[PDB]
Design a protein around this ligand. Structure first.
Ligand SMILES: [Ca+2]
Length: 136
């Protein structure tokens, strides 16, 4: 069980709202920013995880059209592939973390302003937008 705090806006946390994944401050209810890292749905090797909502059990962060949303696992390999991430050292500071996609290993979870998206990471600010602190 963990929250993910943004490296560059450190009072904002990854959270779900109307099934979109985004970051926000003063997250209400606070349980929309609580997550469980579980073994990757598409790969149970060390380092691979899926990111399950604590207040919507069975629903996980999943990418589609390069956007991340909170979606119910429908049991498919397609879902699992797009909802599995490798936790790697933080791209902006390696003592934090970044989430690299399993099926698109050059893309990472990043906030784009308040939206959460799955992007290739080029600039310093892109690295900072893709870096999170695990609060657990
Ligand atoms: Ca999103």
């Amino acid at each position: 069980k963990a929250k993910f705090q943004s490296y560059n806006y450190p009072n904002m946390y990854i959270r779900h709202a109307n099934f979109d994944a985004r970051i926000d401050e003063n997250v209400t209810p606070e349980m929309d920013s609580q997550w469980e890292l579980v073994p990757g749905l598409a790969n149970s090797g060390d380092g691979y995880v899926s990111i399950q909502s604590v207040n919507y059990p069975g629903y996980y962060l999943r990418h589609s059209n390069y956007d991340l949303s909170l979606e119910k696992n429908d049991g498919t390999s397609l879902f699992a592939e797009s909802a599995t991430f490798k936790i790697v050292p933080g791209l902006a500071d390696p003592s934090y973390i970044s989430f690299q996609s399993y099926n698109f290993p050059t893309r990472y979870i990043r906030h784009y302003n308040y939206l959460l998206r799955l992007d290739e990471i080029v600039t310093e600010l892109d690295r900072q937008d893709a870096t999170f602190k695990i609060i657990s």
